[PDB]
């Protein structure tokens, strides 16, 4: 580099550029031009009483909103020159906290001085960690109601307890209004953690929801949801997804007066009929004597518990032996395994990705090149500006068709968060996620068992398929969700552009949602082959040199002739091939590369391609608050 003064000039130039980027990023939030800074308050312990924390944190000017159960306000202070919108959510109530944690810019956790948190706080915190953490801050409540000799030890015990989830984070006190002002100063000046899924879509938190029914007997009508645009520029032609009730097109946007400016009616756009995106979930267009034989004719309540125990023994059997299936002797093996074939190698042997497709694949969409399309769409998001409403503007959305029940939920206390999608995000295809199993639950999960998916601002029920997470073209089906592996879950769902946080829940009992798997979204394609393996075992009971007579793998003579081409392998490392059947029963001669032990077992691998089951429905039951048994 040389020339000390020129090196210092280069360092000054880099300092100036990085500082300009930093100031450009920081000014967009909680200011005169940007949207309000949204904070979500989660009291992790049941001993923590949320209302006095909110009242102490309440006092600039306060504008209190009111809902059915939850009570949130909006704070406005020119001393910090900063605008806040505070909300509160109870842990365990996964619907509310998980559904408006994806819109808040900062999560404020409240902590018990004595214990770290509850089990419900841990459950909510696991869901928050896997769903995507915004900027977070830790605060504590009951420290100043204790003597000093217990106070110092209590803070040390808290510091020991928090390190297991939050390694090195400072704890702030909420005891005095001066501490509250210090905490608002801390929240106003943070390094912001940015979630990519929020930043690529155009999301909005509904501040006020109005409804005008088209026909009260039809129970549908126009919704007027008003709030601040926070993500990208909000364009009318894109569809709008309301997170609990599905995706549908919107009619009009107007910009009324921003009611609460930092320092103190006209319609913006209607949707053209041609430029609007269409509501298209799937593809629209669909001489023998009398007594002689053939041998000589050629010469001429507790039932659920029993199901749980058999599931346990099936999971235990499928862990000791990967895909071992006993052949039925009542029906023929070539009929029961009619759709199965043998692969010489799982890696190199070809398989046509379009060989035998179900009728469900005639109802989904594919991508000619998903990577290039994703990059192109993201470039028109970032590098190109649309004619919509800019971020931070208080607008009102007139959306066309929505049931009345949504409005009822907005009067219950449940928040409404609506985000406008990317192009090609309503159409359904085969989603592939990579997930790993949460240590909290150990219930066995079958491959095609119904689960609840939180996949990038969407919630839906589906029956997946679990596969090896491998870089090859074929992937072996996993008949169970294992605790330690990273697996691929395959579903039918509307397509999402990665990255996206993915949660898998199981409806346990009494309306309770139990988190079973956490992960993210891998590439979307229906050409990802999932291969189910069936392993058939036989006992070599007459052993000679390099060839043996093996039984119990088959029970007919022509089953041996049907599965003759498939190469056999061995638990002790031998590789062989069927030579001849001898008996009318399933006895066969098999050649091998070496000599077999008496304690040995021959086995054959059969393969089929399996597709997921179309059990998609966007409706998800509202959870009851979580508790431990």
């Amino acid at each position: 580099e040389l020339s000390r003064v020129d090196q210092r000039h280069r360092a000054s130039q880099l300092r100036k550029q990085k500082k300009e980027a930093v100031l450009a990023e920081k000014r967009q939030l909680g200011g005169k031009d940007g949207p309000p800074h949204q904070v979500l308050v989660v009291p992790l312990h049941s001993r923590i009483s949320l209302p006095e924390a909110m009242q102490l944190l309440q006092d600039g000017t306060v504008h209190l909103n009111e809902l059915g159960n939850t009570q949130n306000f909006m704070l406005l202070c020119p001393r910090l020159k900063h605008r806040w919108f505070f909300t509160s959510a109870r842990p365990g109530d996964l619907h509310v906290v998980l559904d408006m944690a994806k819109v808040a810019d900062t999560i404020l956790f409240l902590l018990d001085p004595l214990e770290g948190w509850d089990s419900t706080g841990d459950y909510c915190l696991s869901c928050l960690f896997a769903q995507g953490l915004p900027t977070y801050t830790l605060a504590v409540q009951g420290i100043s109601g204790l003597p000093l000799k217990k106070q110092i030890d209590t803070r040390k015990k808290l510091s020991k307890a928090v390190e297991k989830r939050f390694p090195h984070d400072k704890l702030l006190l909420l005891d005095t209004q001066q501490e509250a002002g210090m905490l608002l100063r801390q929240l106003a000046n943070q390094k912001q953690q940015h979630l990519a899924f929020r930043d690529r879509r155009a999301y909005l938190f509904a501040h006020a929801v109005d409804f005008v029914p088209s026909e009260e007997n039809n129970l549908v009508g126009t919704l007027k949801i008003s709030g601040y645009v926070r993500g990208q520029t909000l364009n009318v032609n894109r569809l709008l997804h309301i997170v609990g009730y599905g995706d549908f097109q919107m009619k009009q946007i107007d910009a009324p007066g921003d009611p609460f400016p930092l320092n103190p009616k006209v319609l913006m756009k209607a949707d053209p009929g041609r430029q609007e995106s269409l509501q298209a979930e799937v593809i629209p267009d669909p001489k023998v004597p009398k007594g002689t034989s053939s041998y000589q004719a050629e010469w001429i309540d507790e039932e659920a518990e029993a199901k749980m125990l058999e599931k346990y023994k099936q999971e235990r059997l499928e862990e000791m032996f990967p895909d071992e299936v006993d052949t039925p002797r009542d029906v023929a093996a070539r009929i029961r395994f009619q759709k199965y074939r043998g692969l010489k190698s799982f890696r190199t042997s070809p398989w046509d990705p379009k060989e035998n497709l179900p009728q469900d694949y005639a109802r989904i969409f594919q991508f000619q090149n998903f990577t290039n399309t994703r990059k192109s769409i993201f470039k028109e998001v970032e590098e190109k500006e649309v004619e919509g409403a800019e971020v931070g503007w208080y607008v009102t959305l007139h959306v066309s068709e929505v049931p009345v029940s949504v409005v009822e939920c907005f009067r219950q206390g449940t928040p409404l968060i609506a985000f406008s999608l990317l192009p090609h995000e309503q159409k359904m295809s085969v989603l592939n996620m990579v997930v790993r199993r949460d240590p909290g639950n150990t219930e066995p999960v079958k491959a095609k068992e119904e689960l609840i998916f939180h996949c990038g601002f969407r919630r839906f029920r589906a029956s997946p398929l679990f596969s090896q997470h491998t870089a090859a073209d074929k992937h072996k089906l996993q008949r169970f969700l294992t605790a330690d592996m990273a697996l691929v879950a395959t579903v039918y769902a509307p397509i999402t552009f990665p990255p996206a946080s993915v949660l898998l829940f199981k409806q346990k009992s009494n309306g309770m949602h139990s988190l079973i798997a956490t992960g993210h979204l891998m590439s979307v394609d229906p050409d990802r082959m999932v291969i189910k393996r069936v392993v058939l075992s036989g006992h070599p009971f007459k052993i000679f040199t390099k060839m043996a007579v093996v039984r119990y793998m088959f029970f007919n003579r022509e089953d041996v002739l049907w599965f003759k081409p498939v190469e056999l392998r061995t638990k002790w490392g031998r590789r062989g091939h069927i030579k001849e059947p001898l008996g009318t029963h399933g006895h066969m001669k098999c050649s091998f590369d070496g000599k077999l032990k008496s304690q040995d077992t021959v086995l054959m691998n059969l393969y089929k391609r399996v597709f997921p089951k179309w059990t998609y429905d966007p409706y998800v039951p509202e959870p009851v608050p979580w508790l431990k048994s």
């Binding site: 593809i283 060989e355 969409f365 594919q366 991508f367």
Partner: peptide, 18 residues
């Protein structure tokens, strides 16, 4: 009639062009 099949090419999903 052992490990032989026809397996015709049918009902492909509609692909989105780039």
């Amino acid at each position: 009639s052992i490990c032989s099949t026809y397996s015709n090419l049918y009902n492909h999903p509609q692909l989105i062009k780039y």
